[PDB]
Write an enzyme that holds these catalytic residues in place. Structure first.
Site, mmCIF file in Angstrom:
data_model
loop_
_atom_site.group_PDB
_atom_site.id
_atom_site.type_symbol
_atom_site.label_atom_id
_atom_site.label_comp_id
_atom_site.label_asym_id
_atom_site.label_seq_id
_atom_site.Cartn_x
_atom_site.Cartn_y
_atom_site.Cartn_z
ATOM 1 N N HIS A 202 -28.176 8.512 -77.236
ATOM 2 C CA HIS A 202 -28.681 9.223 -78.406
ATOM 3 C C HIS A 202 -30.058 8.711 -78.809
ATOM 4 C CE1 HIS A 202 -28.144 11.337 -82.377
ATOM 5 N NE2 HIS A 202 -29.051 10.434 -82.702
ATOM 6 N N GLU A 203 -30.259 7.392 -78.767
ATOM 7 C CA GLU A 203 -31.523 6.818 -79.214
ATOM 8 C C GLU A 203 -32.616 6.967 -78.164
ATOM 9 O OE1 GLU A 203 -32.135 5.827 -82.236
ATOM 10 O OE2 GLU A 203 -30.069 6.275 -82.825
ATOM 11 N N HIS B 89 -28.356 9.994 -100.236
ATOM 12 C CA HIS B 89 -29.486 10.909 -100.094
ATOM 13 C C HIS B 89 -29.903 11.522 -101.425
ATOM 14 C CE1 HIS B 89 -27.625 10.425 -96.199
ATOM 15 N NE2 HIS B 89 -28.669 10.968 -95.600
ATOM 16 N N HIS C 59 -29.250 -1.861 -87.373
ATOM 17 C CA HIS C 59 -29.077 -0.414 -87.322
ATOM 18 C C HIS C 59 -29.843 0.151 -86.130
ATOM 19 C CE1 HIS C 59 -28.079 3.549 -88.757
ATOM 20 N NE2 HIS C 59 -29.352 3.899 -88.796
#
Ligand SMILES: *[C@@H]1O[C@H](CO)[C@@H](O)[C@H](O)[C@H]1NC(C)=O
Ligand SMILES: *[C@@H]1O[C@H](CO)[C@@H](O)[C@H](O)[C@H]1NC(C)=O
Ligand SMILES: *[C@@H]1O[C@H](CO)[C@@H](O)[C@H](O)[C@H]1NC(C)=O
Ligand SMILES: *[C@@H]1O[C@H](CO)[C@@H](O)[C@H](O)[C@H]1NC(C)=O
Ligand SMILES: *[C@@H]1O[C@H](CO)[C@@H](O)[C@H](O)[C@H]1NC(C)=O
Ligand SMILES: *[C@@H]1O[C@H](CO)[C@@H](O)[C@H](O)[C@H]1NC(C)=O
Ligand SMILES: [Cl-]
Lengths: 201, 596
Positions: B356-357, B487, B327
């Site tokens: 993005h990271e 979540h 991931h």
């Protein structure tokens, strides 16, 4: 007689900055070129003297102070600096006449689990005088109650460890520092480089 | 010495001990996720337990300094974050009960399997079994089976656990002087003591609902258009005036309508921009992707990646024996150590994920000078919003052509613009009513406004009314469909995805104006603009040291969340959607159901 600079720079282990080590140099010829010629000195800033024209003058005594700090603290090894190192561990005077030498020692003073061999003073009642050393292990009393010699609330151990790991950033990697003090008292010269004291022959 | 002076010395001792212990735990956690062994599990647990025990001891010691006698707000912020009890305010018996409920619900969710009928051995997990069905299958009955079986066999196990979870969480929040556990979660946006920048916990509810009212017209036309296209694919399953069946939305819950793109594409004869073939044609590897991402941030005035980044990160799959958690994540181990874990492939998706990271890394390097307790985003939605706007600029044709991955002869017409905006709205706009309605349901459950015997009844009344989604099978109070999402059954706040979405377009609209971008907002590229990079860095370096309202003001000039930039982004699609729905019914009736 060659000055024992190899003993200072090529030491197996350096001292903690709070208990910085001093090696007095006297009665010898100092090959200053041998310094700049051997290790890749990341920092080589001289104050009051000239590194290009080093071994041309004489001195009464030469003191070599050595210790270990992290990368971002090398800037504190300079006249008129503040911070934990400059205030609580090693202080240079405002009229410093000498050279400050530092190089990265991540390959020597870091280990995977953490090298907790090198320490520094985090708390102290007052700032250090120039060239003063404080190796006391007295529990720092931050509050208004006595500490009785053990750590507790508002009672902290004054010395903290770096815990050098090789994966740290350059600002947190260990740096070996050598401070060369040049003294000139009312005494005949004892330490000269390649100066015109060949006349001794 | 005053109390404030003793706290400054206490926080001084805490910062140096925490940075060491946090690094030991982060390094041990890295060595497991890059080398999944049994020895690395124990070393990760041992280092993690020592770090958790250190915080619990320092939290008790921090609670010996009364906040009222501290006037320096930067000191009060660090003491307040460290004094946070959390579960440590309950009795040892109730906290042990709460941690057991949390572990069981996480175990039920991660291990819950569903077996196909007539073969008690052919069973499927959520990942990848049931998720592959909900994301690729076009069969109504197959999707209905996966949707219902996941909620009737795994969700029913969570129903009794979630009832006791609400009781203990409310007792924990009310012992920390909060109204309920939902009010406890809303404390992430709370700001006090700063004139002109304060923000109350109850204000978040009003701001989320007020901005959501302005999203309704765009979502209703997106909902109406999707319903019309799906009605042509399932004429006997979908009413032209009813809600959308919950099992035909692209995933297990309809959190994103992304997978509905194949059936709802406006102009299905113009291909997407997929520079994946160009990257393979040019022999790109993972290092080339991150090097191009590094050049992007450098072009706007941000620093390059550290030498330790290229040496310590894992930018490729280790492969063969050495296993790893693929991931994509960004690691801030502290003490100058920044890494990125990613099994990068030579595709366009991983190219945009790298931007993005690495945006998270730029955020971490910026506030690294802050004290240890202030090294985080302004609030829970800031960090992920900064990463999203990087893939926005990197995916535009203007940027892809400037780096040699998209052909210059490739021209962009308004039909490909609508295809891109529709794909974006299925993920971005399609998740906003899902997120708000889910979080509002939990807010009302914690507040005590929904009785236990009406949990599932209220859950689907709000799905029909707010989200425009109807359940395909009637569910009584033995179900627990909200807990069927990760979540909810793993105790994570969800409104962060609503605020982050509005934040990222506020950020993008502001930075693109600084970059002097002309034209539609969705075609913007902030590359080579140091002015936009300077305006973003003025907020990144703040960390948590300043109120999030002030941090937001440094980028966009406004002190509060705003939905107008989000609507400005999707306006070319909104006008196209209204024209497409001129002979269609916009809105939905909540009384229709596919089982009526
Ligand atoms: C991963 O763990 C195995 C198991 O001991 C070991 O042989 C290997 O060297 C490790 N690899 C790394 C990169 O640490
Ligand atoms: C608050 O304390 C920090 C040190 O902890 C100091 O740097 C800062 O100037 C102080 N601010 C005010 C307003 O006193
Ligand atoms: C923490 O809990 C104690 C009781 O366990 C309570 O008296 C105190 O006010 C709480 N403090 C905070 C900051 O939550
Ligand atoms: C970043 O770029 C500068 C040149 O602008 C270079 O001097 C520096 O070494 C680079 N940093 C790293 C970590 O490579
Ligand atoms: C940014 O500048 C570089 C050269 O510095 C150029 O090659 C590239 O095309 C430019 N991109 C944009 C979007 O202006
Ligand atoms: C695209 O623009 C052309 C004119 O340039 C117009 O005829 C056409 O209807 C437009 N299509 C869309 C989907 O906006
Ligand atoms: Cl559901």
């Amino acid at each position: 007689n060659l000055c024992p600079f190899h003993e200072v720079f090529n030491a197996t282990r350096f001292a903690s900055v709070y208990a910085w080590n001093r090696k007095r140099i006297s009665n010898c010829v100092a090959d200053y070129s041998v310094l700049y010629n051997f290790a890749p000195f990341f920092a080589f800033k001289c104050y009051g003297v000239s590194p290009t024209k080093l071994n041309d003058l004489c001195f009464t005594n030469v003191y070599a102070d050595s210790f270990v700090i992290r990368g971002n603290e090398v800037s504190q090894i300079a006249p008129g600096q503040t911070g934990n190192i400059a205030d609580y561990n090693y202080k240079l005077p405002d009229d410093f006449t000498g050279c400050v030498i530092a190089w990265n020692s991540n390959k020597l003073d870091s280990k995977v689990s953490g090298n907790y061999n090198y320490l520094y003073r985090l708390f102290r009642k007052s700032k250090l005088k120039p060239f003063e050393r404080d190796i006391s292990t007295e529990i720092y009393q931050a509050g208004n109650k006595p500490c009785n010699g053990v750590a507790g609330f508002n009672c902290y151990f004054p010395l903290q460890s770096y815990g050098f790991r090789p994966t740290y950033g350059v600002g947190h990697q260990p740096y070996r520092v050598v401070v060369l003090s040049f003294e000139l008292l009312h005494a005949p010269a004892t330490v000269c480089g390649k100066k015109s004291l060949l006349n001794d022959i | 010495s005053t109390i404030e002076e003793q706290a400054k010395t206490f926080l001084d001792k805490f910062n140096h001990e925490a940075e060491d212990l946090f690094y030991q735990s982060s390094l041990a956690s890295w060595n497991y996720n890059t080398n999944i062994t049994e020895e690395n599990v124990q070393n990760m647990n041992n280092a993690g337990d020592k770090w958790s025990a250190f915080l619990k001891e320092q939290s008790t010691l921090a609670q010996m300094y009364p906040l009222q006698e501290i006037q320096n707000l930067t000191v009060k912020l660090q003491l307040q974050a460290l004094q946070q009890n959390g579960s440590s305010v309950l009795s040892e018996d109730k906290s042990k009960r709460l941690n057991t409920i949390l572990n069981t619900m996480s175990t039920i969710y991660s291990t819950g399997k569903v077996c196909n009928p007539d073969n008690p051995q052919e069973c499927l997990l959520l990942e990848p079994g049931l998720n592959e069905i909900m994301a690729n299958s076009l069969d109504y009955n197959e999707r209905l089976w996966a949707w219902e079986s996941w909620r009737s066999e795994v969700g029913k196990q969570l129903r009794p656990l979630y009832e006791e979870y609400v009781v203990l969480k409310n007792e924990m929040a009310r012992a920390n002087h909060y109204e309920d556990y939902g009010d406890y979660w809303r404390g992430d946006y709370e700001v006090n003591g700063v004139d002109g920048y304060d923000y109350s916990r109850g204000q978040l509810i009003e701001d989320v609902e007020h901005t959501f009212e302005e999203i309704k017209p765009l979502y209703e036309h997106l909902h109406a258009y999707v319903r019309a296209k799906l009605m042509n694919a399932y004429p006997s399953y979908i009413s032209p005036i009813g809600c959308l069946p919950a099992h035909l939305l692209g995933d297990m819950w309809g959190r994103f309508w992304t997978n509905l793109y194949s059936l709802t594409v406006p102009f299905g004869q113009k291909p997407n921009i997929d520079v994946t073939d160009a990257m393979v044609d040019q022999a790109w590897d993972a290092q080339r992707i991150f090097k191009e991402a590094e050049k992007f941030f450098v072009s706007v005035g941000l620093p390059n990646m550290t030498q330790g980044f290229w040496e310590n990160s894992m930018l490729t799959d280790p492969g063969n024996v050495q296993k790893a958690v693929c991931h994509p994540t960004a690691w801030d181990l502290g003490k100058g150590d920044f890494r990125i874990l990613m099994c990068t492939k030579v595709t366009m998706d991983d190219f945009l994920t790298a931007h993005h990271e690495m945006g998270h890394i730029q955020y971490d390097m910026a506030y690294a000078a802050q004290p240890f307790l202030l090294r985080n985003g302004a609030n829970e939605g800031f960090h992920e919003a900064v990463g999203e706007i990087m893939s926005l600029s990197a995916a535009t044709p203007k940027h892809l052509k400037s780096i040699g991955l998209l052909s210059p002869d490739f021209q962009e017409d308004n039909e490909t613009e609508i295809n891109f905006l529709l794909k974006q709205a299925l993920t971005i706009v399609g998740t906003l009513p899902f997120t708000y309605m889910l979080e509002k349901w939990r807010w009302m459950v914690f507040k005590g406004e929904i009785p236990k015997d009406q949990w599932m009844k209220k859950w689907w009344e709000m799905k029909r009314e707010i989200v425009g989604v109807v359940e395909p099978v009637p569910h009584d109070e033995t179900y627990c469909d909200p807990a069927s999402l990760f979540h909810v059954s793993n105790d994570y706040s969800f409104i962060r995805y609503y605020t982050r979405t509005l934040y990222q377009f506020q950020f993008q609209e502001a930075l693109c104006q600084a970059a002097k971008h002309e034209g539609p907002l969705h075609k913007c590229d902030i590359s080579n603009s140091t002015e936009a990079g300077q305006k973003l860095f003025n907020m990144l370096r703040l960390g948590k040291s300043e109120p999030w309202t002030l941090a937001l003001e440094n980028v966009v000039g406004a002190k509060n969340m705003n939905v107008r930039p989000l609507l400005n982004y999707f306006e070319p699609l909104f006008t196209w959607l209204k024209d497409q729905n001129k002979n269609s019914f916009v809105g939905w009736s909540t009384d229709w159901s596919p089982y009526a």
